[PDB]
């Protein structure tokens, strides 16, 4: 199953301050569940762009609709990959979860692009769950069982009644 969301915001400031903010956005009081950020790799490529890969660890609650055994607080690793193109003054950022991926994959793309007098940031999120197939399988077993049970009950009941008749 896949769900998609989008958002736009305009930052009343220059591309340099924004992108710099992004690299340093943690900690901040609006983001309390963030435990760590680590820089895995960073360099400027052949075409002159800065390429960074970072690792975050967050704390949080797994969703109510998940199996109530996995409910509770856990920690998730998240990867964040970014490209800055200083020529066009544009930035692309991508995060996705590394673990709990069987349950969901939640990916976020956000592009910052300059408008010569503000930085326009476009956000896209794609959510994906395999929960649907798990539920479906559990249903298959339920149906098999209900069917088999009902066949025994039919056979017994009809016997009991046919006898009580004759």
């Amino acid at each position: 199953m896949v769900l998609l969301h989008k958002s736009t915001h305009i930052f009343p400031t220059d591309f340099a301050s924004v992108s710099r903010a992004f690299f340093n956005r943690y900690p901040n009081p609006y983001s309390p569940h963030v435990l760590s950020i680590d820089t895995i790799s960073r360099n400027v490529d052949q075409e002159g762009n800065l390429r960074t890969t970072r690792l975050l660890k967050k704390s949080g609650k797994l969703p109510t609709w998940v199996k109530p055994f996995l409910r509770g607080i856990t920690e998730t690793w998240i990867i964040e990959v970014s490209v800055v193109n200083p020529a066009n003054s544009t930035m692309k950022t991508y995060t996705r979860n590394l673990d709990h991926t069987g349950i969901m994959k939640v990916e976020e793309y956000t592009t910052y692009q300059f408008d010569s007098s503000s930085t326009i940031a476009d956000s896209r999120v794609k959510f994906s769950s395999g929960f649907n197939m798990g539920i479906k399988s559990k249903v298959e077993d339920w149906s098999r069982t209900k069917f088999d049970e009902n066949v025994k009950k039919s056979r017994m009941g009809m016997a009991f009644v046919i006898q009580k008749l004759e």
Partner: protein, 72 residues
């Protein structure tokens, strides 16, 4: 207050590297005055400590696998 590394021992190293990077990012890279790594020492120290710690964490397979992805 500054960011923590998942390995507290690296936090100090991390802080230095990050500090260094900020400067270079703002003053050199974006203004076209540089496209090279003027943070090699701090970076080496940080990433050594970090990889040392990373071997211990059971997440390294997943991270390695996900670095082979190209999301753009």
């Amino acid at each position: 207050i500054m960011s923590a590394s998942f390995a507290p021992e690296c936090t100090d190293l991390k802080t230095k590297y990050d500090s260094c990077f900020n400067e270079w990012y703002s003053e050199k890279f974006l203004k076209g005055k540089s496209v090279e790594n003027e943070c090699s020492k701090q970076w080496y120290a940080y990433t050594t400590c970090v990889n040392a710690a990373l071997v211990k964490q059971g997440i390294k397979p997943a991270l390695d696998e996900a670095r082979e992805e190209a999301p753009f």
